[PDB]
Every structure is written in structure tokens, then in C-alpha cells.
A paper describes a structure:
mNeonGreen, an engineered green fluorescent protein (GFP) derived from lancelet, is one of the most brightly fluorescent homologs of Aequorea victoria jellyfish GFP (avGFP) yet reported. However, we were ultimately successful in creating a variant, designated as NeonCyan1, with a tryptophan-derived cyan fluorescent protein (CFP)-type chromophore, and two additional mutants with distinct spectral hues. NeonCyan1 has the ‘double humped’ excitation and emission spectra that are characteristic of FPs with Trp-derived chromophores in the neutral state, such as mTurquoise2 and mCerulean3. To obtain insight into the molecular basis of the empirically determined biophysical and photophysical properties of NeonCyan1 and its variants, we determined the crystal structure of NeonCyan0.95 at close to physiological pH (pH 7.5), NeonCyan0.95 at acidic pH (pH 5.6), and NeonCyan1-T207D at close to physiological pH (pH 6.5).
Screening of a library in which Thr207 was mutated to all other common amino acids led to the identification of two variants with drastically different spectral properties relative to NeonCyan1: Thr207Met (NeonCyan1-T207M) with blue shifted excitation and emission, and Thr207Asp (NeonCyan1-T207D) with red-shifted excitation and emission. To investigate the mechanism of color modifying mutations, we attempted to crystallize the NeonCyan variants under different pH conditions and ultimately obtained the X-ray crystal structure of NeonCyan1-T207D at pH 6.5. This structure revealed that the side chain of the Asp residue at position 207 had displaced the water molecules that had formed a hydrogen bond network from the indole nitrogen to the side chain of Thr207. Accompanying this change was a displacement of the backbone in the vicinity of residue 207 with the Cα of Asp207 in NeonCyan1-T207D positioned 1.2 Å closer to the chromophore than the Cα of Thr207 in NeonCyan0.95. Comparing the structure of NeonCyan0.95 (pH 7.5) with the structure of NeonCyan1-T207D (pH 6.5) revealed that the water-bridged hydrogen bond network that had extended from the indole nitrogen of the chromophore to the hydroxyl of Thr207 was displaced by the side chain of Asp207, and there was a close interaction (2.80 +/− 0.11 Å) between the indole nitrogen and the carboxyl group of Asp207. In contrast to WasCFP and NowGFP, NeonCyan1-T207D has the terminal carboxylate of an aspartate side chain, which typically has a pKa of ~ 4, positioned 2.80 Å from the indole nitrogen. The approximately eight units of mismatch between the pKa of the aspartate side chain and the pKa of the CFP chromophore are incompatible with the co-existence of the anionic chromophore and protonated aspartate. Relative to NeonCyan1, NeonCyan1-T207D has a similar Φ (0.27 versus 0.29) and an increased ε (42 mM−1 cm−1 versus 29 mM−1 cm−1).
Residue numbers in the entry: 12 to 67, 71 to 236
Write the structure that this text describes.
């Protein structure tokens, strides 16, 4: 079905220390909006919960004229896997690998996280990140089974100082995407992310809008 509810098991390590979180959410597949609640199964998170944004379900994303490729792959059941890499301005690096299963309108997601090189006194390990910038991503389709998403990410610390990262996401589809998708690229997506957090529990909200009118959107996204 189009998705209506989801759950996330997100787990792995930050600076060689294991964490594990589980929770349920809901979303709007005609608007790309999603809510998620997460709870730790291994006690207090030893890092900023902000570092799990944006990683905490593009199956909810519509396109202007119909379903996104992500949403289309869920509805026919064939699906996709995800690899994301992020390199931070202080030399830290994070990967996330995602796998999904579908039951009618419900998605179960698994996100394996590995983060390394976060300095002890840095704002990740001291939980001093306070917000994230809304931002543009660019989707390209280098072949009928792959989508590449690129974006520049920033957390806020202190007096609006930015803690910057570069992100690249590789989507691998089981079945080729409809041919029309390949002839209508690139796609630009604008997203806004909101987090309420404690050391054990998070409430997350995401809004997203896809744009297929290409223009000089490339000068605007960069």
C-alpha cells in the first residue's frame, strides 16, 4: 500500500560505543511528512541525538505528478537499500545502511550507523548541537537501478555557528525504475527536520517537497 505507519530500529556505534533505539511513527504519503518516536534500549545516549538527524523513509515522498521512485518501489513490493556517507568539518565520518520490509501500509526500517572521529570536546560528544538548517538535496539517476542524493548539511551550535558536513546517499533498487523517471532528472527536494530529545527518548518530524521543474535549480541548490 502507500505508507501510513513505520517503525525504525536504528543502532550501531559512535566513537566505538554501541547505541540502539526503536520506535514507531506515521506519515503522509501525499505530502512526504513523517513523525517518529524513538526510545533507547541501551540507556543514556553518549552523544548528541541530533547526529541521528537526518538519518531517522523516502517511501513517504510524493513527486509533483505521482509517486516518487522510492514510494513506487514500496507499493509494488520490490523495494530498495540505502548507503549514506557524511564527512564532517572536524574530520569525523558517519555511514548509515538501511534495509526495509513492507506489510500493507506499514514499513519496518533498519538503519546500521557507524560514526568515528568525533572529537571528545566537540559539540557531538558534548551534546551541544541545538538545531539543523532546512536544505535542498539533488537526486540524479546514473542508471535505472540507482539514485544518488547529494546535500550539504549543517547543525547549529553557540550563536548560530554552523557545524557542517557533506552527505552523499546511494539508493540501490531491486527492479529498474519506470523509464520516465530517468528522462526527468535531476530532482531537487527541500526538507525541514525537527527534533525534541532527552538522553533516552526522541520525537522527530520531517517535511519534504520534491521539484521536477529543473531551471537553474542547480545554481540555487549548491
Amino acid at each position: 500500500s502507500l505508507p501510513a505507519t513505520h517503525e525504525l530500529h536504528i543502532f550501531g556505534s559512535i566513537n566505538g560505543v554501541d547505541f540502539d533505539m526503536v520506535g514507531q511513527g506515521t506519515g503522509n504519503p501525499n505530502e512526504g511528512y513523517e513523525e517518529l518516536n524513538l526510545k533507547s534500549t541501551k540507556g543514556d545516549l553518549q552523544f548528541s541525538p541530533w547526529i541521528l538527524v537526518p538519518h531517522m523513509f523516502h517511501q513517504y515522498l510524493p513527486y509533483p505528478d505521482g509517486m516518487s521512485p522510492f514510494q513506487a518501489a514500496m507499493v509494488d513490493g520490490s523495494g530498495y537499500q540505502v548507503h549514506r556517507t557524511m564527512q564532517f568539518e572536524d574530520g569525523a565520518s558517519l555511514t548509515v545502511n538501511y534495509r526495509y520490509t513492507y506489510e500493507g501500509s506499514h514499513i519496518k526500517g533498519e538503519a546500521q550507523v557507524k560514526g568515528t572521529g568525533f572529537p571528545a570536546d566537540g559539540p557531538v560528544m558534548t551534546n551541544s548541537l541545538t538545531a539543523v538548517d532546512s536544505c535542498w538535496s539533488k537526486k540524479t539517476y546514473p542508471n535505472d537501478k540507482t539514485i544518488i542524493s547529494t546535500f550539504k548539511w549543517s547543525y547549529t551550535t553557540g550563536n548560530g555557528e554552523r557545524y557542517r558536513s557533506t552527505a552523499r546517499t546511494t539508493y540501490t533498487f531491486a527492479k529498474p525504475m519506470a523509464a520516465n523517471y530517468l528522462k526527468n532528472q535531476p530532482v531537487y527536494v527541500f526538507r525541514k527536520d525537527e527534533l525534541k530529545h532527552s538522553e533516552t527518548e526522541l520525537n522527530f518530524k520531517e517535511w519534504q517537497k520534491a521539484f521536477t521543474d529543473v531551471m537553474g535549480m542547480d545554481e540555487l541548490y549548491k
